[PDB]
Write a protein that binds this DNA or RNA. Sequence first.
DNA 1: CACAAATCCATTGACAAAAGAAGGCTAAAAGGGCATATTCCT
Lengths: 72, 72, 102, 49, 247, 1344
Amino acid sequence: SDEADEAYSVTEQLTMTGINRIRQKINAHGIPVYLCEACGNPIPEARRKIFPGVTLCVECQAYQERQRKHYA
Amino acid sequence: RVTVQDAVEKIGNRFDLVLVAARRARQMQVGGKDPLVPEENDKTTVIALREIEEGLINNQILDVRERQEQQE
Amino acid sequence: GDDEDSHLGDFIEDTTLELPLDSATTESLRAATHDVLAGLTAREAKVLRMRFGIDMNTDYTLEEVGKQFDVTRERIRQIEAKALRKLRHPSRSEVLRSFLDD
Amino acid sequence: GQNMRVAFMPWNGYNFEDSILVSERVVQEDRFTTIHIQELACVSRDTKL
Amino acid sequence: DIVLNPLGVPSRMNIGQILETHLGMAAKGIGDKINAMLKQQQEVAKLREFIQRAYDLGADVRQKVDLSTFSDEEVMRLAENLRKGMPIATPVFDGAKEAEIKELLKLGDLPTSGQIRLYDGRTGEQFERPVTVGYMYMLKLNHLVDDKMHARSTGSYSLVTQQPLGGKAQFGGQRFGEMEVWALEAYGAAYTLQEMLTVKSDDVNGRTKMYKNIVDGNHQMEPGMPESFNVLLKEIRSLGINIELED
Amino acid sequence: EFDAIKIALASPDMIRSWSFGEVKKPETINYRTFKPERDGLFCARIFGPVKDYECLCGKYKRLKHRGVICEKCGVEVTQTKVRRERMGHIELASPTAHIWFLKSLPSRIGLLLDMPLRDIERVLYFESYVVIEGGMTNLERQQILTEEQYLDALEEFGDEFDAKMGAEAIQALLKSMDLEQECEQLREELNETNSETKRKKLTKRIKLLEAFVQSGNKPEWMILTVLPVLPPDLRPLVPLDGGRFATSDLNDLYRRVINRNNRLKRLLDLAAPDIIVRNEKRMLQEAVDALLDNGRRGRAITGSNKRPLKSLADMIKGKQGRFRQNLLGKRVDYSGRSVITVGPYLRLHQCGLPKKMALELFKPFIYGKLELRGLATTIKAAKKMVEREEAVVWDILDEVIREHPVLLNRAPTLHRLGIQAFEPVLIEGKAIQLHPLVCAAYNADFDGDQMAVHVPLTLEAQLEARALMMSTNNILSPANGEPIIVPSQDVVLGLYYMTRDCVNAKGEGMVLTGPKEAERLYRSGLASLHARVKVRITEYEKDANGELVAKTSLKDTTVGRAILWMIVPKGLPYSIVNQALGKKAISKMLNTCYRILGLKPTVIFADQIMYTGFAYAARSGASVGIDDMVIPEKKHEIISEAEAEVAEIQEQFQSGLVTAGERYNKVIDIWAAANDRVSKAMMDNLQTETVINRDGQEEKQVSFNSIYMMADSGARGSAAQIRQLAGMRGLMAKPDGSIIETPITANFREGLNVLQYFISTHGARKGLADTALKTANSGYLTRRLVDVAQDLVVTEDDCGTHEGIMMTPVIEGGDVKEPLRDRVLGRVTAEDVLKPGTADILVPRNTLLHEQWCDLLEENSVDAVKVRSVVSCDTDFGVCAHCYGRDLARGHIINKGEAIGVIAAQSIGEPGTQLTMRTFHISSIQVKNKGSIKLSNVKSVVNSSGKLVITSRNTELKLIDEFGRTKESYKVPYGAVLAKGDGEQVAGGETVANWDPHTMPVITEVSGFVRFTDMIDGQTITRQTDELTGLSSLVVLDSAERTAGGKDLRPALKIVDAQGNDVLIPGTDMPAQYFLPGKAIVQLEDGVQISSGDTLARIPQDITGGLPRVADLFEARRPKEPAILAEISGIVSFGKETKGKRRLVITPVDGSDPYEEMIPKWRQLNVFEGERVERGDVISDGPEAPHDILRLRGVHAVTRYIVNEVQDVYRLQGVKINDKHIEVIVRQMLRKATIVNAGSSDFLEGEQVEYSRVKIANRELEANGKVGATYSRDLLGITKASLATESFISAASFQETTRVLTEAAVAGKRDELRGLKENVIVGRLIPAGTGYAYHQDRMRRRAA
DNA sequence: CACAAATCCATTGACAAAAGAAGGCTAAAAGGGCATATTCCT
Ligand SMILES: [Mg+2]
Ligand SMILES: [Zn+2]
Ligand SMILES: [Zn+2]
Ligand SMILES: [Zn+2]
C-alpha cells in the first residue's frame, strides 16, 4: 500500500541480510589449530577462548583483513 | 442478474455464451422478437442471460428459429 | 511540463469535427422535415425539395423549378409561398418548432 | 488545520484501509471550510473578420 | 467527531498519534475545567490559582510563567483565550515524557490511561474495552475531490491524431494504457476492447455512428479503421516504403 | 475490409502513383491571409481544399460543385478531411541514399554489395570514386580510388573508366548488378569454402540476396531519386491564440530539404564548379538523411529551439511515438476518473457512483431514453433539459443504469483482476464507492487513490463485462487458485475478536438451544461475546451423492463462534469456525467454502463474513492505547549485560587479541543476540500476560492487549514490528549494508534522541528511495514477458499426446517444501496412476485432477503422476486445452480461446512486485526421522570395512517410508562412508554417509596390492616422507610438480594381486591401475597389501532471490561458472595435456569418442578418466547453464530446472504462484530450433528456424513417402526469443522499429493478422477471447 | 335544375434586388543592381 508501508519491508530486508552476513562471518565450532596458519605460530588461548574456531593469530588475521579491504 | 455459473451449466466455454446472449439481445432489443421468459422489468442483456439460464436458448435453438424464419 | 512528456501538440484540439450531438441532431432534421414533407402534397412536397437543397445534388433556381414542374417562374413562388404558408401553421408543423431555440 | 475530538476504533467499516468517518457536527460547525478564489480571464483578439 | 482506524499504529509505527492525542486530551480537559470555572464566573483568585498550578508541573521544565506582573486585566483574558483548551508545547526531541502527559490527565479529571468508555450512537449500548479519544490536530490537504472528479461523454479531439485530449481542463478522457489492453486480453473481452480502442477513442466515422446508435437504442458498433493506424500508414509510407492493406 | 498486411520497397513510379502533385516551393502560407501557398508544403491543388466543399480562390463554394476542380485556383473541391489522405512527392535534383539501408546496424546496402560501410560512406560523401565499367585495366566494379589515382586512371585513357562518385555511382552499381548471377557464383564459391565462418557468412548473405530475388525488389530502389512527403494535416500548421503559430518539425525539415534541392537545381543550370555542386549534393544527402531519421547521422541538426528537431522515424518508434504510446494506449470517450472511498455497505457485485459522473458518462443513453419517452422533443431539447437536471432525468438515469455495468480500473493494472466490472449505484457526493474486499484485488488503499470508470457501450460489450469481467465471477486469483476476495485488514480483526475463548466471562459454561439463542443471549447482555459454552448446533455435512445430510451435536465452544456459525452456509463443518479464526484460517475458510459449495454460495458468504466481521469489530471498540505498548521489566537488565559485553570486547581489543574487523562482528552478534532475547522477553510479557481467576485460582490465557490482538490475528502487522514498538529496535544498518555497531537501544513508546533518529534515517531513506523505484519498473518484467508469449492462445481441445513431466515433491532432506497436492491440483494426467500394488489403475488417461482425485491420491500416497505439461503439448500455433489444465479464476477445465500467454505473463509478473526489487544474496547424510533407505543409482561394492561406500556418482538417498512414497531424500557424494546398506528399515537420527572435503578418495573397486606403475621420483613425482612422524608416500604431482622427464607419463597406483598381473576391472577391457590426477594424496607405499574397497588415495576438494535474478533467470544467460557435462554416455579417458587447457574424451561403449574441447583445470574435474559417465553427468564445476540442460538432458529437464529454479525465488520470498504459468513462458523460450539434416526439407541443415515449420513439415513428410527430417532444439532468452517473430507489426510495436522495418521492408514480408498485438493495432477484434469465433470463420472465408 | 360569387391555379405585368464578371486603383512583392580592402569558424 502506502510507500512507507512497503519501504519498511525494503529496509528490514536490507538490514536482516546485513545482520545475517555479519553474524555468519564468525566461525562457529571446530578443533582450534593452536597455531596461526600463516605463521604456524601459537594463537594464545584467550583468543582461542573468545571465538571458538579461530585459525589465525592477530597479526596474520590483521594482514588478511587489510588485504580483503581492497576487495581483491 | 448476479452470477453466470448457470450459463456455464447451459453451454460451455463461457464465450459462445456471451456472444449468443448478444445475438438474442439483438433480437430482443432491436425489435425482432420478445423474450420467452417473463422479464421483471430488466435490461435486455439480463433477459437474454436469464432465458439462456432456463435451457431455452443457445446456438441450436436460435439457429433452428433462424431456419423457421427462413421459411419466410 | 508535468514531467509527463506531453508535447504541446497533444492539447491542440480540432475545429473541423462535427459535434457528435450535432450530427445526432441533424439525422432527425432530415427525418423530421421528412415527416412534415411526408404529409405534404406531391407538388408542395416535391416543389419544396425542388426549391431547397434537399436529398440530392440540388438547389435548382426558381426559373429552373419553373421548367421542370412546367408551370411558371412566377407561379412556382406562388405555390412555394403556398408551401410553407400551410407549413407556417402552429399545431401542424410543430416538429421543426423543436428545432428553434431563441 | 484544526483539532477534532478523535477516537480510534473501527465503527462499522467506514474506515477500512485508510478511511475516516467525520461527524456531521464537523461539517456543520463550518470547521473545515475553505475559500478558493479561482480566476477566469477572457480576451478580445480582433480576427480577420 | 472523527473516528480513525486503530490498526494504523502497529504497521505504521507512528506512536506520535496515540501519544499526542493523549496529551491533547489532557490539554482540552484543562480547557474544559477553565471553562467550567469561567462561564460560571467562579472567581479571579481561584481561577488564578488553578491556572498557575497548571502552568507548572514536570521536572525542571525550562519556562517559568507566574502571575506576579499579572493580572486581571490578564487572567480573564488569559482564561478567555485558554477556554477552548490550554495550548501546550513540546520541543521536537526534548518533549514531554509519558509521565507529564499522565500528570496533565490527572489534573483535569480525565482517566489517566487516556481511554474512556464510549457508547455506540445507534444501538445506544456500550462498547467493550474502552476506546481512546483526544484532540488530534487534523488538516485538510488539497487533494479536494471536486477538482478531482471528472468525466466526459464526448468532448473535443486532438488535431493530428483523432483522439480525445488529455486534461480535465480540456476534458481529456482516461488513458487506456498498455497494461489495460493486456488486462482485457487476459479475459475474453474482445468486443469491449474493440470498442474501447476503436469507437470510443480513435475512429472518426464509427464514433459518430456509435453516438447515433446510442441515442437510437441500438447498441451496435461499426468498426472502421483506427485513425492512428491511418496516420501510421502515411508515416511508414512517407519513407520509400510501400506498406499496404492486402485484399 | 482488408487482410494480410503487406510491406516492401517503394518504386519511384509507386511514389509517383501516390502523390497528387509535386511540391516545388519552400513557401508554406501567405502571412497576410493564412491560405496555403501555390505549391509549397501546404498546397491547394496538391493536397486539396482547406474547408468543407470549397475551392481556395473562392470561385466555387457549394456542395453541388462536388468533385469539379476549379480552373483558376485548380483545387479539387471535396471534403476538407482529404488533406489528411493525399500525399505529395518530390523530384530530387539528384539521387541520394536512404539512411535506413545505409546506416542501420546490419547495413542492408552494406552486405548487398560486398562492401564495407565506410567504403560506401567515402563514396557517398564525395570522397573517392567507385569503379563501374572500369575497363580491363585494373578493376571491374568494386575497388576504390583516389584523386591521384582517379587522374592517373584518367591519365593514359579517358575511355574505359566509366566511374562516378556518390549517389549516382551507387545507383549505377545497383542498377547494373544482377541477383541470379551473384547468387549462383557464390553458390559455387560456397560449398568449396564452407569453412565454419565462411560457410555461415556466405550462406546468410546469399540468403539475403535470394530474398531480394524472390521479392521482385530492385536494389537501386534503395537509393532515392523521388521522395514522398506526408499529407499536410499530419504535419499541420495550427493557429495559436494570440497571433502565434505551432508546427511540427517535419515542416521545417521538408522546407530545408526543398531549399537544398532548389539550390542544387540552380547550380546545375549554372554549370558552376564541381566543388560547390558536390558540397550541395553532400548537403542534400545530409538533409534527407536527417529527415528520415535523426540518430545515425552525427548531429541531430536542431533549430532555434535548443532541442533537436524531431524527424520522421521518431514519430513511429520510442515510448512517445505512435506505436508504443498512441496506437495501443489511447484516451477514451465515456470514461471518467475520481477518488475512491470505501462505503462498506454495498455488495460485492456493485460499486457506488457519484451522480454527476453517472450523468456525464451515460449522457447519450439518457438522451435516447428521454426521446423514447417523449419527455423531450428532439436531442437539442434533451441536452438542454438534462443540463437543467429536472426531476425526470433522475428516474431516467436510475432506469438506464439499472443492469448496465461499468468498468473500474486503477493506474497500475498489473494482473487482469486490476480491472473488474461493477453494477452502479447512484450516490451523491463525488467519490467512487468500492467493496472493500476488492481493494486487495486492486491493491489500492484509500489514501486518496483514484480509479477510473469506463462505460461498456456495445451490447456485446455489456455482456462481456458482465459474464467475463464482473467482480463476482472473478474472485480466485489467476496466478494461483487461492481466492483473492479474502477479508483484508479490519473484518479479520473483528472476526478474530469474535471467536476467542476466555476462561471466565458472563454466562460461562451454559448450554444453548442453538446459535440463535446464543445471539439472543449476547445482545441482551446476559453472556459475553466470547464465553466458553456448550452449544447445540447442526452441521450439514453432505456425504452422499449431493445429499445434504444434517446431524446435530453439543459442541463446546464460544458464544461468538456460535453467532458466526449463522452466516456459514449448509456445506462446511463446524470445525472451521471453532478456532481462534485469525487471518490465515479465515482465508482457508473461504477457500473451503469455494471448494465444497460452489461459487454463488461462496460470494454470498463472503459478503456475509465481511458484514458480520465489520459489525463486531465495531462492537469491539478495539483501540490502541499508550498503556497497551508494554515495556518488559527485564529489558534494562539485558541492556546492561550487552553493554558489559561490548565493554569486554573493547577491553580485549586494547589487550591486542582481536582485529577491529572482528571486534565489529563480535559486537554486532552480541547486540543481535540481545535483540532476539529482548523480543522473546517482551512477547512472553505481552502475548499471554493476561491472568484471570474463575472459581478462585488464576489461569493463563492469550492476552487481550489490542496490539497483540492486531498481530496474532494477522490483521495488520506482525510480531517483529511490535518488537520495534516496545523492545529494542534493531541495529539500523547503513544504506549499503554496513551495519552501525551501536544499536538504537530505545523503542518507540519511549523517545529517540537525535542520534538514534539520525541512525534510523539512513535505512528509512534508502528503503523509501528504492520503493519509489519499483514504481519506475512496476511493469518492466511484465512487459517483457507479455511481449514474448502474447501470441500464444489455447486453440484446440486435445492433441492426444502422452508426454509431460513426472511430478514429485520439492523436498531437500528436510520437510516437504511442496507436497504432491499443489504441484498436481488441476492438471491432466497423461497416463494412468498406478498404486504401488502394480494393478490399481486409478485415473485412466484424461482425468482432470481436481481436489477429489488429488485427495484420493493423497490418502493413497502414489507420488508417480505423469502429467501432460503445456511445453510438450503436440499442438500447433497454440496449446491443447486438456494439456494446459484448469487453473483459471474459474475452477473448471480451461476453455479454448483463453489468452493463457497473457495471463501467464501477468501471473509471473505481478507478484514480482511482492518480491524484493534488488538482487539480495544468502557434512554427512544424517537420517532425520524414521524409515527405510533407498540409494538411487547405487553403484557401490562391499568396501574395506566390508560395508557400502559410493563408487558411483549420482547416488541420491531417500527416506523410504512404507507408504509407497519417498519421505526424505539426500545426495551421497563419491566414496561416501555408507555406514549401512540399501534396503535397511533403520532408526531415526543416524548418519549413514560420511566423506571429507579434503578426502575425495579413489578407493579400490576390488582387492589388490600396493604395486605402483610409473610412480617415479624426480621424473614424475616426489618421494614424499612426512617425517613429523616419518611416513613416506608417493603422492601424485601435477605437471608443474612433475618434471618434463616424466610429464608424458600417467601416474597410478596399479591394482594388482599377489602374483604379478594388473587385475583388470571386470566390465572393461582395461587392467585396473587407478590413474591419479594432481594433488592425489597417496599413503600406501610400494608392495603393501589391500583388499576390496580400501582407502587408496583420498584427494581433497548460497541462493539468491531478487526480482532481476528472475528476469535474468528467464533469459538463460550463461552464468560465470558454467558446468559442461558429457555428450557421450560411456567410459571416459584423458587426452592431450595443457594447450592452455587439459584434454580428455568420453569414450563410447562401441562407437567413437571424437568429443574433446578446451577443458581448463581452473575449473576442477569431478570425474577421473576411467568412469562410464553417461551424457548429462557432472564433470565441470559451478552452476549448470540451462542451455546444456536442454541439449543434453532434453527439453523436460530444462523446463523442470527453470520452473524449479524460478519457483524457488518466489518460494524463498514467501510468495505463492502456480507452476503452470512458468511453463508457458518456457514454451516461448524454446520455440526456435535448428536442423540435423535436410533430408526432405527445404532449409539449410546447419540452420535455425522455429519449431512449428519443422513440426508441421516432417510430420507431414511421413504422410508422404518422403523421409522425415531431424532438428536440433534451440533455446532463446525471452527478449531474444521475442524478437524472432512471424509478424512485422507485432515487432515494430515493441522492439527497435527501424531494425524490424528495414528488414521486413527488404524482405517483402507479408503479415497476415494473427496474435494479439497486431489486431489491436489494426483495431479489429482479437483472435484470442470472445473474438475466437470471429477469427475462425475468417478461416472458413480463407478456406475456399 | 340552375344562376351568381369566392377564389384555384394560370398568367401578366409592373418593380426592387442581388450577384456577377469586367474595369479602375492601387498597394504589394519582386527584381534589379551598387568595385581602396575585409580571404578556415563552427
Ligand atoms: Mg495507494
Ligand atoms: Zn600468525
Ligand atoms: Zn476554385
Ligand atoms: Zn495442450
